[PDB]
Design a protein around this ligand. Sequence first.
Ligand SMILES: [Mn+2]
Ligand SMILES: [Mn+2]
Ligand SMILES: [Mn+2]
Ligand SMILES: [Mn+2]
Lengths: 341, 341, 341, 341
Amino acid sequence: IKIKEVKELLPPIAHLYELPISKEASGLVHRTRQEISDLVHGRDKRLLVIIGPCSIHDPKAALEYAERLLKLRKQYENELLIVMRVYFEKPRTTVGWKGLINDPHLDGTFDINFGLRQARSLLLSLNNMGMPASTEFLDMITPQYYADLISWGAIGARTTESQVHRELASGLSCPVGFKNGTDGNLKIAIDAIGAASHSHHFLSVTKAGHSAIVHTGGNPDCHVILRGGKEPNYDAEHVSEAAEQLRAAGVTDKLMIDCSHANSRKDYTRQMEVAQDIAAQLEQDGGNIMGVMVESHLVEGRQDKPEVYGKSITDACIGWGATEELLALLAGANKKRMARA
Amino acid sequence: IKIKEVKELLPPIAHLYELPISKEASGLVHRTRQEISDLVHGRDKRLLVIIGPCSIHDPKAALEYAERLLKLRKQYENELLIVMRVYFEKPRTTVGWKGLINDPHLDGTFDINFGLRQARSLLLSLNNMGMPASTEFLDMITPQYYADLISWGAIGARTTESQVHRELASGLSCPVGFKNGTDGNLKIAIDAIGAASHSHHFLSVTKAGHSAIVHTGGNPDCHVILRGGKEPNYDAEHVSEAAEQLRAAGVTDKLMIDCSHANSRKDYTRQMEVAQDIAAQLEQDGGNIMGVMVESHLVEGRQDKPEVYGKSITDACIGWGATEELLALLAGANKKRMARA
Amino acid sequence: IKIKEVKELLPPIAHLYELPISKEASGLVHRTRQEISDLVHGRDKRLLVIIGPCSIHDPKAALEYAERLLKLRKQYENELLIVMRVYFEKPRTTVGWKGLINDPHLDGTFDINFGLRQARSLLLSLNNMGMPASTEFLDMITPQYYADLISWGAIGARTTESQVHRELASGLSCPVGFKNGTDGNLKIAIDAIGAASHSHHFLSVTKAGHSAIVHTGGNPDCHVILRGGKEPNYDAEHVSEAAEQLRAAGVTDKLMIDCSHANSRKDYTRQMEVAQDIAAQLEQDGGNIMGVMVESHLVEGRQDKPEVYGKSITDACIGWGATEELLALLAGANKKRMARA
Amino acid sequence: IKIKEVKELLPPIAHLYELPISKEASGLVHRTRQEISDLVHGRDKRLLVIIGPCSIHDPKAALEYAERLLKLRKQYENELLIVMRVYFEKPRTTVGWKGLINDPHLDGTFDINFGLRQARSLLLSLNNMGMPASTEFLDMITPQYYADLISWGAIGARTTESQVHRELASGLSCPVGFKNGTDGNLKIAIDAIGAASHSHHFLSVTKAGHSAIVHTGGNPDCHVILRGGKEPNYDAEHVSEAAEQLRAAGVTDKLMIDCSHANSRKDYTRQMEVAQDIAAQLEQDGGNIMGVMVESHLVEGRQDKPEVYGKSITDACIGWGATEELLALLAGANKKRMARA
Ligand SMILES: [Mn+2]
Ligand SMILES: [Mn+2]
Ligand SMILES: [Mn+2]
Ligand SMILES: [Mn+2]
C-alpha cells in the first residue's frame, strides 16, 4: 500500500551505449578536475567560478547560456576557471519539483528514463563544445548515469551532514565542495571533508543496474563552501575564522564562497554586493579563497511556471548583463591577487 | 577510479527465503504499527517508549535484554507501548564503526552479507518472542532486507533535512519519527513530516537486487522527535512551542521526546532527570507528548572495545536497574494522565 | 574455469526503448499471426509461403529483397500468404558463423549488442513497410529482444527433439513450425507439437535481463515441416503418411513443406522441382498442405566471403527471377485448389 | 500473452552462500575430473563406470544407495573409477515429469527454488562422503547452481545435435559425454565433440542471475556414448566402426557404452548381458572402451507413482544384487585388460 508502483528503469549502460563519452569530453573532464584539484590545494591562484542556473529546466536555454559563457571562460582563462552550473536535482524545503531528471516534462509525469537521457545528452553536448560542468549530487543512484561528465560536484547544505552523502563523495572522481548547514554550521562541512577523504564500504548500484558492495578509496579534493546561515558568512572575518577552523582539523584551508542563497538573503540583486566584497578581499589579500558560486541565467528573477524563456523556476537568478559585470569584476580583482605572488 | 573494489551482494530475496516472516511476527508488526499510529494522531493516550541500546553489536545480549524488557512491556501495557531499540546503522560525526550491518565482526572486514543476515535473524527472533522492534533508517538499500520486521523507524538528526531520507520515509509501512537537527532546528523536522506524507517518485532497489523507479503513497504517521540542540529541548515550554509550530504547519502536534543525546548532554545518568521532567509534565497536563526515547542496556556506561557483555560500544546507556526505575516512573505518571481523559 | 571471460550485455528493454514497436508493425504482426493460425487449423486455404534468404548478413540487401517481395505478396494475396525469411541465428554442423546476431561484423568480433540492435532495427523497418517476418528461434535468450516483431517461427531440425526448445515454443505468441529430424524422423516433430501445445514451467530471462521462472500457456498453433531426411519427403505419399500420423496423435494434419535443405539434396536448382511436385499435389488434391518454405535471395548460389551483394554466405538460394517463377507456379496451382470450395 | 506468469527465482549466489563447496568436495571433484580426463585420452586404463538411478526422486534413498556404492568404489578402485548417476533433469518424449529440480514435490507445483536447493544439498552431501557425481545437463540456466559439484556430465541423445548444448559443454569444467541420436546416428556425437572443443561466444546467465555474454575456452575432454538406436550398438563390430569414425574426425577414439536405454531395449536385466559382452571385449582387447553406463538402484524395476522406496519412477533399473554382480564382472575383466599393459 505504501508503495503504489514499481516502474522500469533503464540501467546506466543503456545510456552509455547511446551516448559514449567522446575523447574530447573525456580530456576536458580529466583536465578540469586536475586544474580544480590544484586550486583546492593552493598550487594555482586562479579563481574557480561555478556559475549558471539554479536549475536546468530547458536544455535549449542551457546551451544558449553555455554558448555565451564559453566566450567569457576563454576571455578570463588566466584569472578565472569558469565551470557551468548544470544542476539536475533540487532539494525542496518540503515538496516541489525535484528537477529535470525526476520530472523533465515539468507536469508530474515523472519520466525519469527520459530525464536521465536528456541530462546525459546535455552534459555530453556541453563538454563537447568546451564547457565543463558541475552539479549537485543529491540522489544515490543517478550519479552512475552522468558522473563521468562532471568536473566538480556539490553536496547541498541539507545533506552535508548525511553519512550516505559523505560516502558517495568518497567515491567520486571529481573534486567536491561541501556547503555549510542551512543555519550557518561550518563544522559539519569540515567533518564531511574528513569523512569523504577516507575509504568507505557501503551499498550502491552498478552501471548494469544491480546492487553491490562498493569499497571507495577516499576523495582527497574536497573543500568547504560558505553559503550563509541565519546571517551571511562571506566577509573577510568569516573567511579568516573558517580558515583557522580548517587548519585545526588538518584539512585544506582554501574555500569557496557562494554569492547566492543565504549569502544574498535570497535576493538575487544582492549577489553583486557579495562579489564586490570578495573582489575587495582578493585585492587586499584573500589567500584563503579558491572559488565563488553564482546563480545566473539569461534573464533575471524567477517564476512559478516556465512561461518566460531563460528564467529560473527555482531560486531567482541574476540576468546575463549582470553576469558579464560580475565576471569582469572578479577577473580584474584576481588578476591583481595573482600578480602579488 | 576512486572505487577500489565492487563486491558481491546477496539480494533481499535470498534472506527472505531463509528467514520468511512468520504469521506471529507479521501480526505483531501490523498491530504495533496501528497502535503507534493511534498514538501519533492522539486517539490513544498510552506513551510509546522506544528503549534499548544505542547500537546492537551482539545479538545474544540483545535477546537477553529483550526477554527482560518483554516482562515490562506486558506489565505496563495499559500505560506504555514499549518497543525495543534495535539499531543496526549508526551515523558518525566523521568516521567510525557504522554498525552491525556494515561491519558485523567489529574488525574492519565489512562482511555486509553476514551483517544483513544477522540483522534479519535477530529481528525475526525478537518479533517471534513478542517484542516489536525499531531502528534508524540511514542507508537507502538496506531497508528492503528487514523493514517488514520494524514497527517504528527513526530518521536521524543528521538526515532529517535530506530529501532522499524523506522520500524513503514516504514509502515505509511503519510510522516514522523525525529528529530535530543537531543544533536544535525543529523546522526541518516539521518540514520532513510535510514531505514524507506526500507521494514521491524516486530510484530505489527492488527485493531482487535491481534498480527501479518507485512510486510511494506517502506516510501519514510521521511525527517529530525532540532530542536537544545547543540546549536541551525537552521541557514544557519547548513542547508547547513545538506543538504550536506543528499546528501551524497543519501536521500532528503529538511528539516524542528523547531522554538521551543532546537532551542529556552525553551524560547517561541524566536520562532519568529528563524522564522525571516528562513525568511531571504528564502529571500536570502533557497532552502533546506521545512518546519517549531512552538508551538503555544490560549494563550501564560504554566501552571502546566490546570486552564486557551487554555494555555499549557507542553512546553510554543506563543499565537494567535504572531502566526498571525509569519505566515504573513513566507508567505511574501516564496512568494519571490517562485517567483525566 | 573454462570461461575465458564474461561480457556486458544490454537487456532487451534498452533496445525496446530505442526501437519501440510502431502501431502499424504491431497490427501487421497480430493480423499475420491470426491469418497463419487460420491456415494451421484449416479455416482458410491460402498457402503460407515462408520465403527469403537462408540467412541475413546484410540489412541493406534484405530491405531491397523485401521491397521486391512485397509487390508479389500483394499481387498474390488471394492465393498466397507470403512472409519473408529473416533468419538471424544459424545452427552449424560443427562450427562456423552462427549468424548476424552472434557476429554481425562477419569477422569473429562477436559484437552481440550491435547484432541484437541491428536485428531489431531490420525487423522493425520490414514490418513498417508491410512485410511480415519469420525466423528460426535457436537461442534461449535472444528472443526477448525481437519476438514481438515475428509473425511465424521455426524450430530447426537439429532442435525439434530438444525439450528446452519445445518449452520455448510453448511460450511464443506466434505460430511455430517444427522441422522433422536431420535423418527424416517425423515422429519427433509430431511429439514436439504435443509438447509445445501444453503449459510448462522453466527458467528464462526477463526483458530486464534477469533470470526468472516462467509459466507458459501452451502454443495451439504449431505444425510440422517436412524438410527431408536421408531421402526427400515432399511427395504425396509422404504427405499422406504424415497426415495420418498427425491425426493419430490428435494434432493438426495441415503441414508445411520445405523446398530446400534435404528436400533439394542441398542443391538450390532443385527447389523448383519440389515446388512443381507440390503444385501438382495442390492441383490434384493437396488438402493437407498449408504452406511451403523456399530459400531465395536477390542473386542465386552462395559464396564463402560476403563479396557479392545479395548473395548467400550460408546455404545456396534461388535468385530473384527463379523466385518470381516459383511464386507464380504456386499461386496458379493454389487458385485451383481454392476454387474447389 | 502466451506466458501465464513470471515467478521469482533465487540466483545461484543465494544457494552457494547457504551451501558453499567444502574443501573435501572441491578436492574430490578436481581429482575425479582429472582422472576421467586421463581415461578419455588413454593415459590410464581403468574403466569409468557411471552408475546409479535413471533419475533422482528421493534424496534419502540416493544417499543410502551412495553409501552402498561407495564400498565398491573403494574395493574396485584399481580397475574401475565408479561415479554415481545423480540425474536431476529428464528429457521426455512429449510431456511428463522433468525431474527433481523442475518439480521436487512430484505433484505439479513446480517449486524450482526448493528443487535447486535440494539438488545442491544432495550433491554436496555425496561429494562430502567421498562419492563423486554425474548428471545430464539439459537446461541452459540450472547448471550454474550445481556444476561445481559435478565430475562428469552427459548431453542427451535428444540434444546432442543442439548447438546451444554444444555451447554449454564448451564452457563446462568437467568432461562431457555426448550420446548418439535416438535412431542411432553417431556422426552428430562426433560433430558435437568437434563443436564443444572449440571456443564460443553466446548468451548465458551469471551466478548473480543476470544475463551476460560468455566467452568459453572449449572442452578438451569430450567423448561419445554408444546408447543404441534402431539397433543396439554395444558390440565389438559397432565399437570398431565408431573408433574408425572418431579417428577420421581427429577426435578421441575412446568411448563409453551405455548398457541401458536402446542398448538393452525393453529388458532392463539385459544390462547384465551388455556388460557381459563388454567384459568379453575387455578380455579379448577392448582398447577403445573407456567407460560404461548402468542404470541401477536399491530395488529393481520401475513404477508410475513413488510408492516403493528406492525404486525408479523413470526408466527401469537393475537392483542392488545385480549391481554387485555386474561391477565384479567388469572389475575382473578390466583387471586382465590392464595387466596386458
Ligand atoms: Mn539555488
Ligand atoms: Mn545513541
Ligand atoms: Mn538454410
Ligand atoms: Mn534412463
